[PDB]
Amino acid sequence: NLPEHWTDMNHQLFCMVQLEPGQSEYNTIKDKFTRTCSSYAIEKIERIQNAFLWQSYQVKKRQMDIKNDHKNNERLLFHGTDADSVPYVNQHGFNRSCNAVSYGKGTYFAVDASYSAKDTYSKPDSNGRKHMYVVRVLTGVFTKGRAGLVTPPPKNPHNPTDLFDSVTNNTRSPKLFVVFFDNQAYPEYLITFTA
Amino acid sequence: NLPEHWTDMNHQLFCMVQLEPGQSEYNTIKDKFTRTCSSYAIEKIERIQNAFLWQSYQVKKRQMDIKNDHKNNERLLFHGTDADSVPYVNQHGFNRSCAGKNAVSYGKGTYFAVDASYSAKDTYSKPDSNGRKHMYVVRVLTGVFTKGRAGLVTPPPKNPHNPTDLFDSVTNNTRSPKLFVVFFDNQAYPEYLITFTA
Numbered sequence A: 001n002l003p004e005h006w007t008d009m010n011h012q013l014f015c016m017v018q019l020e021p022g023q024s025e026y027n028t029i030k031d032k033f034t035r036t037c038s039s040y041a042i043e044k045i046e047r048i049q050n051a052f053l054w055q056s057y058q059v060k061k062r063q064m065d066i067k068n069d070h071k072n073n074e075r076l077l078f079h080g081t082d083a084d085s086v087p088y089v090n091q092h093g094f095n096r097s098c099n100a101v102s103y104g105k106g107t108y109f110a111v112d113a114s115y116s117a118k119d120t121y122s123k124p125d126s127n128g129r130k131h132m133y134v135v136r137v138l139t140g141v142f143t144k145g146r147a148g149l150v151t152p153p154p155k156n157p158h159n160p161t162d163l164f165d166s167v168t169n170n171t172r173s174p175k176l177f178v179v180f181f182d183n184q185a186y187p188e189y190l191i192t193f194t195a
Numbered sequence B: 001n002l003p004e005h006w007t008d009m010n011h012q013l014f015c016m017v018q019l020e021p022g023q024s025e026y027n028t029i030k031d032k033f034t035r036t037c038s039s040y041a042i043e044k045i046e047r048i049q050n051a052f053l054w055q056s057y058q059v060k061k062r063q064m065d066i067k068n069d070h071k072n073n074e075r076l077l078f079h080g081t082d083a084d085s086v087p088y089v090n091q092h093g094f095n096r097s098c099a100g101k102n103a104v105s106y107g108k109g110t111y112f113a114v115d116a117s118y119s120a121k122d123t124y125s126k127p128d129s130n131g132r133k134h135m136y137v138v139r140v141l142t143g144v145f146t147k148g149r150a151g152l153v154t155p156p157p158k159n160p161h162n163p164t165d166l167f168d169s170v171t172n173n174t175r176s177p178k179l180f181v182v183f184f185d186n187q188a189y190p191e192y193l194i195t196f197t198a
């Protein structure tokens, strides 16, 4: 059930597709970035077409939509990474086993591109190029995180196995989300950009 | 896509089903266990019916069956654990972030034993306040494997010049595997819980 906006993959299961500047898809993703990163130069935006990651992610989305009994479980967030991690993320997605972990030992996603644009996350390579993903994240029902969490807290210490889906720095005005399970995040676009 | 021999769960997502001695399903698990644990006695065997864990696992199996060249990707292995972990495993499966350091480490993952005798050690199946020990029987996607190393946080690459094309699991010994380590969620389905005592 590979999405409409994807382009033909000649019966293959992984492709990185460079977007055409000035077309609708590129414009939409560029505007999400330039909201907080207008001072950075975009070199390119690639659509990540990973059939296996998409399938595993869509299964978790369907499960979370059933469990939470509504469909506002997904957010579009940013993740900055070093050039050496890009091949792994494109192929395997986000791995909590692989920077600070103040809100728990999971994968960190930013509301604002400006946060992911810090050199500590999007480490400039030899040539000065920085890399940031636009990520579909199943944030679901979230609570405030804390150091040392290995999973989100229970929604009620009466039923200790019924968990929040993610944690955040601030529930009223979140700027980051942490997820603690594989396939709760789909890397959708990779932005290559410079300071 | 739930298996047709599961009990009706009436739109519920999770059920533990107590098996009856004399049924082939109970007896094959008992035989697999007593092959190496004939000194212990089984209190009961429960089939774990977890709709969500089963779906995510079955998706990973289909992917590994596609990726690998007609391999038998799945093994039935043992996992001993403490009473305090059983409700989390029943609901959420095996979380590498919760895993103990194994006395012989082949990587930082979840460990599964070929032999019940290994899982039956008090170090893994810690006896509870009533002297009950707990062991899962687990469908594990071992796929294509190599000898692991204590440093691993994922399985190693098959080819050092293609670092993202990974082995599916690692083992203690490729000629005579006695344990397997997996490093991803939904790579193992807890199928049965054995409750046993001395």
Ligand SMILES: Clc1ccc2c(c1)sc1nncn12
Pocket (backbone or CB within 6 Å): A078, A079, A080, A081, A099, A100, A101, A102, A108, A109, A110, A115, A116, A117, A121, A176
């Ligand atoms: Cl504390 C923390 C750690 C990692 C991290 C953030 C915040 S925001 C962000 N964007 N990409 C990575 N990250």
